[PDB]
Design a protein around this ligand. Structure first.
Ligand SMILES: COC1=C(OC)C(=O)C(C/C=C(\C)CC/C=C(\C)CC/C=C(\C)CC/C=C(\C)CC/C=C(\C)CC/C=C(\C)CC/C=C(\C)CC/C=C(\C)CC/C=C(\C)CCC=C(C)C)=C(C)C1=O
Ligand SMILES: CCCCCCCCCCCCCCCCCC(=O)O[C@@H](COC(=O)CCCCCCCCCCCCCCC)COP(=O)(O)OCCN
Ligand code: SF4
Ligand code: SF4
Ligand code: SF4
Lengths: 37, 318, 153, 96, 57, 122, 24, 177, 129, 38, 98, 382
């Protein structure tokens, strides 16, 4: 989205913190239940 | 006791770090640093010292001796007592505290007192506000160092520094969490003042920014304190992230693998990095600096605790 | 005997001659030449000389350039807050003596009118080496101190 | 606790060392040669809060294999509340 | 070129001081006690040291 | 050698490849290390007074060659120094006691303090 | 303080000479 | 306008794999690691420094340093007292008094250059008709006391006889200009 | 369509032609208050008429610049507004007319100046486009 | 990986620079004073 | 106690002073010692999993402390009043009639 | 709240004695105090001949020496009508431009040392100690080279100076690149400079900036393109002109103006006509040593030009060149006599340092040294 790119350009460290942190709030959310095998 | 064997060599380390900084930061600028005093300036620290000691006071003022004649003592004693828990090799920590890391955090929280008191006893509004600004900076990059240590702690089991350096036998936390080492270094740069982050330490505003009654001992003790705090906060970027006293483990035939020598090599790398990064980068102005500790190294530190906690909880790597 | 006094004076003088940090009153061009004497080629950080930005902790004060009649009180006030084993170096003709502006109304006829001077670097724009040799003469002035022998009278 | 006695004596021996470093210059060299900046209270209260939340991070950091995926999510809820507070402080503009 | 060694030398004699910080408080503690220091010295080990100095009579 | 107390060690770390071009009367050994590198550092002087040395001890015969103003070693300008009025160097005895330091003709330290009164009193 | 903060955003670097590059 | 200028200067870099390029440069210092790399290259390169007392900076025969009154090869001070340098001097450092000596040929009873009140501009070397006053490349004459720095009447400027071996060289090489 | 005047502060005006017409009509109307036999009124009338004419004829700002060779229309608006200020100022402290004595000594020194000396050369003619 | 596109190879250390020291008159300059017609 | 008292709270109080001046027989059971739980581990085994709501409520108390220190000591130094003086033209009478 | 912000680092900005009326950390007004370096230059020149007057000019701006001698010479040729040769003009520019480089190398990296970058200072000062090997070689004194005399120039280049200036120009693009790679890209630099001391063009004109602070704002105004006062009308070079006006544009200009000055140096080197060094008018140019000794009529002029002077005719002109600081102009009223008459020296830094009051309003106290940085404030001219 145009405004999303405007936000990951103007503010790189709060848009790459809500994405270096998503990979931490996202791995145990879905990747752990996936690891039922 | 054996506290002499950790304070005297550290005093020599700080005295020779003033020379190591002048000399490395000079080599960077295409010029030999202190080079006439000793064989290679090796006696230049002793010359600076023996000069500061032989300089008559500007005013005796031994009356006010309990207020700010023990505040530099406090700052320096804290910078030196945070060295107990720092382990140089397996079983070479002076006192293995099972909560070692939190003790370092507390020692920093008392260094805040050191700065604030030694600035308030200087009855100079400009110098006192400068000391308060420096304390607020040292304490604003302490939430970021706190969270960085929470990351390197999640990776480790316990706060025991000997364990944090023993938990890296497989891989140093500098390799997976390199982005974190860059944030711990750029915070240890900013927690201490000696950094691209030293507007309160802008060449002039520093001297007129810590005290009014110098007498030389105050000037040396602050700089001896800043350089020990620097050796310490570089001896933390090498316990936590680099392997505290661990080799690369290739087990060479040429190398008999001494531990303390590896810890020394790594803390030398981080001291040289302190110097190099003082030479090559402009100051941050303390108004972008405080807006970098909150808006840049706190979000990027919080994310890292959630990233290194997540990626270690999903796959049971804890 | 006296030999111990001779060696303790040699030691004190070696200290004060090795680390001699001057408050460089860099007024005018002789501060640009002084900056060349602090620059890469003629190191002053080699000889221990560290240009202090404050009068509070400084062994010397390399006044350079034209001491104006208005910068005379400021120079004196700065010289009064150096720790007692202090020296002053006059660098450039305008700072050491009246100079190009000896007869100017606003220019003091040499800082020797405000601060007591110990080594006058000669030459109106002294070569950076010339200021460096003036400092290597201040080092001699230190090596001739023997303050301990005089404290024992 | 047993290992706290070395630093207990460390404080006193470093006191002695600093007192000697104080007395060394004193002996030698004989006769002949803004109303208020409230942002410093906001920065201070905010460090207080963030060091409280790091205090809460520490046990959760050292004990995360015990609390398998539930202590983690409870700490992430605590941390989402921290983040809401920190975003209210960022937007309101206390980080300046 | 080996010109950087002159500037390496102060870092060496500041590295040769942390080696001393580490080995002094090791060989001083290795002297007062015949054995090196134990890092992970939990209460099990102090209890076993008590009973050990009580077993050698 | 035996001076780990000076920058004289930097000069003695030179001379390792340098060639010695002449030596003046005072003993100052004038060295040249060209070709290798670092222009501006290919001509120096070893003062032969390892302590108490200072600049200006380099006589005028060499003070040209040593500041790169000329390319004539002092062994070549010594055939050009004037014999009738030629004077040896004086090391710039600035401060080292009176009668070595220079004095004007009214300083009251100069033996024979002249009086400038243009009128000849009666 | 409502003082105008120094916004460190701007237009990208483009070397701007004068019009007299080729033929005055 | 600054609001719209910001909106547009941030809508210029607004295409994926360009926001990523700029993010990476901010996220991992790129311009700053190019600063550290250059600084390292200079940390290891040879040093442009000069251990002064033993080797000194390059000069030229036109270099203006300590003033020296020249002499004619056969003694006889070259300084006939025309007073042209006393006239040309911008700072009026040179004070010349002249007297017909007993030999009959004019000479300066007083030729005192005040080095402290002197700008070292070489005007005296140009103005002198016979090259009587020249600046010797000395430039190393820092004096402990100001009175010594006032160069006496034809006695200390007569120390140019020591510097003649270099002054004659510089003049023989500069006279072509 | 103009992106920006290279000059800082002189913000690009989109409605350049319209405000120029407004300013030049205001100027023509306001200049009537100065006596007619004054060089200032002849000048103002002439150049304001020329620029108002070329602004009415052409439509784009670029064509206004191209024909009326006086830089950029933003600087032209600055000039016109400053001229309006001057006419509203000149009405006050009226300097028009010449007092009887009127001693004005024109002095001419014709010494040629050497060519290699700062001489303010004319610069490009409006064939720059 | 830096400002070295085979062009910084023009480095500051010259090592062959002022090869003819100034006061050495290998060629005697002439420096005309007046134009030949004058 | 060190950290959150004498590095934060009495720091606050120091600020309030400096500015705004006022004017044998034991039977050690060697079980439960085989794995000694450091105090942090045996606080984390509880606070984050079993009594976790008494830990998310201090979360809300720290959030209320943040909101409080903001709404109280913003001191009209940001959008609280740095919005504008809020003076409009069409709502003014240009002082022709005072 | 008044703060007596003095010289932060002495020896860089010598007598800077601002009296800042602050508001917390935001500066509300900056009141510079002048006169601490007010030597009697505009009075002492009335008392000395036009030749004795020249050494004051290299001592007016101490970081860009020969530009002021070139501005004075062009003010005693504007009156004298003293046509100088082509070689004198080319040398005069090759040294006015070497001086532009000597100044931007200082006024960039002394500014960059006030901001905090310590190494660019010492690299640029090694470069400056290479260019002073040219000053000191062509005239004699490393800084005050009283070399650009009224008629032409003091004395010809040595027989190895163009080769050395070439061997320097080849290796000087790299030094500018290093000064640029170390400061231009840095986010700690841009942050310290972007939107700092922004001067709208109307302000740079009002306050008579007329320098690198008049081409920041975007006013294309270089007195080498406006009023070509030498071979400048022959030499090709582009005047870099900023687009925002912030202290980051003035830095980018001073770091491009340091490359166009390299172009001008390389041109002056490649086209330097072998002509006479001084004007043939031997009543304005002292004859050579060889001629005055051999010719009686030359000896008379060498006597009446090193004692009496020119006696330039009665006039009054304002000759302004583009010195590195800005438009350095010397308004030289000349009574008929051999001594000038109120040789007023318009020196940028007297008009720039005025700008500090409005440039550094609402900037933080740590910016007040960055403003003083980019103004190239040298107090000799103030
Ligand atoms: C931010 O920028 C800054 C700089 O910029 C480049 C600086 O330079 C510096 C660095 C300069 C300083 C002086 C900092 C302070 C450091 C010191 C004074 C060095 C400290 C040295 C010691 C711990 C030694 C103390 C005492 C000594 C050596 C002597 C004691 C014993 C004797 C007298 C006996 C000696 C006799 C014999 C024979 C030998 C044994 C600072 C601070 C700075 O702030
Ligand atoms: C290529 C390797 C880089 C190594 C660099 C080593 C340098 C170490 C020494 C110190 C360098 C200089 C210190 C400079 C301090 C200032 C740094 C800074 O804050 O820069 C920006 C922020 O930089 C940082 O915070 C750098 C810290 C990096 C941490 C990690 C970043 C993201 C990591 C992504 C991980 C990807 C994988 C994770 C999930 C799989 C601030 O933003 P700005 O104002 O400059 O511009 C944008 C304004 N909105
Ligand atoms: S004495 Fe000469 S060089 Fe020194 S400041 Fe004065 S004019 Fe400048
Ligand atoms: S250089 Fe010569 S003429 Fe010039 S002031 Fe000095 S003594 Fe006088
Ligand atoms: S030095 Fe030259 S100008 Fe002076 S009196 Fe002697 S001959 Fe004449």
């Amino acid at each position: 989205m145009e405004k999303l790119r405007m936000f990951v350009a103007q503010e790189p460290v709060v848009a790459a913190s809500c994405l270096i942190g998503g990979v931490g709030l996202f791995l145990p959310a879905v990747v752990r239940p996936i690891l039922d095998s | 006791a054996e506290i002499l064997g950790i304070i005297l060599p550290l005093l020599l380390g700080v005295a020779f770090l003033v020379l190591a900084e002048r000399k490395v930061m000079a080599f960077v600028q295409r010029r030999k640093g202190p080079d006439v005093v000793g064989s290679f300036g090796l006696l230049q620290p002793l010359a600076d010292g023996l000069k500061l000691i032989l300089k008559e006071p500007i005013s005796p003022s031994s009356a006010n001796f309990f207020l700010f004649r023990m505040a530099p003592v406090a700052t320096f004693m804290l910078s030196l007592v945070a060295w107990a828990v720092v382990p140089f090799d397996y079983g070479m920590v002076l006192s293995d505290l099972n909560i070692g890391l939190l003790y370092l955090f507390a020692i920093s929280s008392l260094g805040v007192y050191g700065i604030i008191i030694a600035g308030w006893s200087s009855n100079s509004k400009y110098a006192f506000l400068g000391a308060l600004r420096s304390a607020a900076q040292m304490v604003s990059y302490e939430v970021s160092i706190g969270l960085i240590l929470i990351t390197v702690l999640i990776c480790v089991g316990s706060c025991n520094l000997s364990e944090i350096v023993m938990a890296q036998k497989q891989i140093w936390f500098g390799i997976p969490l390199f982005p974190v080492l860059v944030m711990f270094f750029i915070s240890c740069l900013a927690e201490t003042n000696r950094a691209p982050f030293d507007l309160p330490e802008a060449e002039a505003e520093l001297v007129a920014g810590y005290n009014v009654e110098y007498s030389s001992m105050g000037f040396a003790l602050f700089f001896l304190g800043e350089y020990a705090n620097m050796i310490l906060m570089s001896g933390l970027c090498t316990l936590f992230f680099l392997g505290g006293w661990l080799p690369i483990l290739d087990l060479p035939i040429f190398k008999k693998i001494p531990g303390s020598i590896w810890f020394s090599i790594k803390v030398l790398f981080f001291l040289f990095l302190y110097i190099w990064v003082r030479a090559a980068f402009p100051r941050y102005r303390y108004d972008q600096l405080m807006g970098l500790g909150w808006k840049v190294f706190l979000p990027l530190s919080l994310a890292w605790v959630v990233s290194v906690s997540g990626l270690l909880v999903t796959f049971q790597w804890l | 005997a006296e030999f111990v006094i001779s060696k303790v004076d040699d030691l004190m003088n070696w200290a004060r001659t090795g680390s001699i940090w001057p408050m460089t009153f860099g007024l005018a061009c002789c501060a640009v030449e002084m900056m060349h004497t602090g620059a890469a080629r003629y190191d002053l950080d080699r000889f221990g000389i560290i240009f202090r930005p404050s009068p509070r902790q400084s062994d010397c004060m390399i006044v350079a350039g034209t001491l104006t009649n208005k910068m005379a009180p400021a120079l004196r006030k700065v010289y009064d807050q150096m720790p007692e084993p202090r020296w002053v170096i006059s660098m450039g003709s305008c700072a050491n003596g009246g100079g190009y502006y000896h007869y100017s109304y606003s220019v003091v006829r040499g800082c020797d009118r405000i601060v007591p001077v110990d080594i006058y670097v000669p030459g109106c724009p002294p070569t950076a080496e010339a200021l460096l040799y003036g400092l290597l003469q201040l080092q001699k002035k230190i090596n001739r101190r023997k303050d301990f022998l005089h404290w024992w009278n | 606790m047993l290992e706290f006695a070395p630093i207990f004596i460390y404080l006193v021996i470093s006191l002695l060392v600093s007192l000697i470093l104080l007395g060394v210059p004193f002996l030698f060299a004989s006769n002949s040669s803004s109303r208020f900046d409230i942002r410093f209270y906001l920065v201070s209260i905010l460090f207080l809060i963030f060091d409280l939340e790091v205090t809460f991070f520490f046990p959760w950091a050292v004990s995360l294999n015990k609390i398998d995926l539930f202590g983690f999510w409870s700490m992430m809820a605590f941390l989402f509340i921290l983040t809401i507070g920190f975003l209210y402080e960022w937007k309101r503009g206390a980080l300046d | 070129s080996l010109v950087w060694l002159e500037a390496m030398l102060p870092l060496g004699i500041i590295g040769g001081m942390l080696c001393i910080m580490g080995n002094s408080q090791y060989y001083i503690h290795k002297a007062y006690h015949g054995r090196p220091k134990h890092i992970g010295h939990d209460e099990w080990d102090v209890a076993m040291e008590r009973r050990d100095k009580k077993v050698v009579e | 050698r035996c001076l780990p107390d000076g920058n004289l060690l930097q000069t003695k770390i030179h001379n390792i490849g340098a060639t010695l071009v002449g030596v003046d009367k005072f003993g100052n050994k004038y060295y040249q290390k060209l070709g290798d590198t670092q222009y501006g550092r290919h001509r120096w002087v070893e003062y032969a007074s390892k302590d108490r040395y200072n600049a200006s001890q380099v006589p005028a015969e060499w003070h040209g060659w040593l500041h790169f103003i000329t390319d004539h070693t002092g062994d070549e300008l010594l055939s050009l120094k004037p014999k009738r009025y030629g004077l040896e160097h004086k090391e710039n005895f600035s401060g080292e006691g009176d009668a070595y330091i220079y004095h004007s003709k009214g300083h009251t330290l100069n033996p024979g303090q002249k009086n400038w009164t243009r009128y000849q009193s009666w | 303080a409502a003082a105008a903060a120094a916004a460190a955003a701007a237009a990208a670097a483009a070397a701007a000479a004068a019009a007299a590059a080729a033929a005055a | 306008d600054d609001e719209e200028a910001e909106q547009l200067a941030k809508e210029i870099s607004k295409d994926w794999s360009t926001v990523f390029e700029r993010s990476m440069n901010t996220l991992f210092l790129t311009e700053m690691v190019r600063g550290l790399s250059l600084t390292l290259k200079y940390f290891f390169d040879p040093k442009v420094t000069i251990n002064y007392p033993f080797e000194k900076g390059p000069l030229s025969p036109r270099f203006r340093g300590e003033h020296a009154l020249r002499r004619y090869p056969t003694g006889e001070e070259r300084c006939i007292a025309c007073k042209l340098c006393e006239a040309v001097c911008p700072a009026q450092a040179i004070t010349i008094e002249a007297e017909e000596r007993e030999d009959g040929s004019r000479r300066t009873t007083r030729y005192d250059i005040d080095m402290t009140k002197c700008i070292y501009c070489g005007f005296c070397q140009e103005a002198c008709p016979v090259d009587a006053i020249v600046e010797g490349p000395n430039f190393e004459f820092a004096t402990e006391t100001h009175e010594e720095l006032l160069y006496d009447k034809e006695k200390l400027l007569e120390n140019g006889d020591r510097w003649e071996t270099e002054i004659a060289e510089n003049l023989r090489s500069e006279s072509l200009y | 369509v103009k992106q920006t005047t290279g000059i800082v502060g002189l913000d690009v005006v989109p409605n350049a032609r319209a405000v120029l017409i407004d300013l030049y009509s205001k100027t023509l109307k306001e200049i009537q208050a100065v006596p007619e036999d004054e060089g200032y009124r002849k000048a103002v009338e002439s150049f304001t008429r020329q620029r108002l004419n070329v602004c009415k004829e052409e439509e784009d700002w670029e064509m206004i610049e191209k024909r009326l060779g006086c830089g950029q229309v933003e600087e032209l608006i600055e000039e016109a507004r400053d001229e309006l200020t001057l006419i509203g100022k000149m009405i006050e402290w009226d300097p028009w007319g010449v007092p009887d004595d009127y001693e004005c000594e024109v002095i001419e020194n014709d010494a040629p100046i050497p060519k290699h000396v700062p001489q303010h050369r004319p610069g490009p003619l409006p064939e720059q486009f | 990986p830096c400002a070295h596109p085979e062009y910084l190879e023009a480095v500051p250390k010259a090592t062959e620079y002022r090869l003819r020291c100034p006061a050495t008159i290998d060629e005697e300059a002439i420096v005309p004073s007046s134009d030949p017609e004058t | 106690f060190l950290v959150v008292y004498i590095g934060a709270i009495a720091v606050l109080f120091l600020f309030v002073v400096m500015m705004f001046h006022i004017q044998s027989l034991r039977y050690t059971v060697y079980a439960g010692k085989v794995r000694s739980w450091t105090n942090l581990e045996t606080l984390g085994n509880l606070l984050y999993t079993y009594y976790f709501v008494w830990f998310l409520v201090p979360s809300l108390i720290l959030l209320v402390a943040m909101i409080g220190a903001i709404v109280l000591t913003m001191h009209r130094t940001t959008k609280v009043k740095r919005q504008d003086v809020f003076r409009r033209n069409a709502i003014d009478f240009r002082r022709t009639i005072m | 709240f008044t703060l007596n912000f003095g010289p932060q680092h002495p020896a860089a900005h010598g007598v800077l004695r601002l009296v800042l009326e602050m508001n917390g950390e935001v500066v509300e007004r900056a009141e510079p105090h002048i006169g601490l370096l007010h030597r009697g230059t505009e009075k002492l020149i009335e008392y000395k001949t036009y030749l004795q007057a020249l050494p004051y000019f290299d001592r007016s701006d101490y970081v860009s020496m020969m530009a002021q001698e070139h501005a004075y010479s062009l003010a005693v040729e504007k009156l004298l009508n003293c046509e100088v040769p082509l070689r004198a003009q080319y040398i005069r520019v090759l040294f006015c431009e070497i001086t532009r480089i000597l100044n931007h190398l200082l006024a960039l990296t002394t500014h960059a040392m006030d901001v905090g970058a310590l190494t660019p200072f010492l690299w640029a000062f090694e470069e400056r100690e290479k260019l002073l090997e040219f000053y000191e070689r062509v005239s004699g004194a490393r800084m005050h080279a009283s070399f650009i005399r009224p008629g032409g120039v003091a004395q010809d280049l040595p027989l190895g100076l163009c080769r050395d200036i070439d061997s320097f120009t080849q290796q000087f693009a790299s030094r500018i690149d290093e000064l640029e790679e170390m400061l231009t890209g840095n986010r700690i630099w841009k942050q310290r400079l972007v939107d700092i001391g922004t001067v709208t063009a109307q302000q740079a004109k009002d306050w008579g900036f007329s320098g690198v602070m008049l081409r920041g704002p975007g006013v294309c105004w270089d007195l080498r393109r406006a009023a070509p006062y030498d071979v400048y009308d022959q030499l090709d070079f582009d005047v870099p002109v900023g687009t925002r006006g912030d202290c980051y544009d003035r830095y980018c200009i001073r770091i491009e103006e340091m490359r166009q000055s390299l172009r001008i140096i390389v041109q002056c080197l490649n086209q330097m006509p072998s002509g006479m060094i001084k004007a043939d008018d031997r009543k304005l140019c002292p004859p050579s040593r060889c001629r005055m000794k051999l010719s009686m009529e030359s000896s008379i002029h060498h006597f009446e030009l090193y004692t009496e002077g020119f006696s330039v005719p009665a006039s009054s002109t304002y000759t302004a060149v583009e010195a590195p600081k800005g438009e350095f102009g010397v308004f030289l009223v000349s009574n008929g006599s051999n001594r000038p008459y109120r040789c007023k020296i318009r020196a940028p830094g007297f008009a720039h340092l005025q700008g500090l009051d409005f440039m550094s309003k609402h900037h933080m106290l740590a910016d007040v040294v960055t403003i003083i940085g980019t103004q190239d404030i040298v107090f000799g001219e103030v």
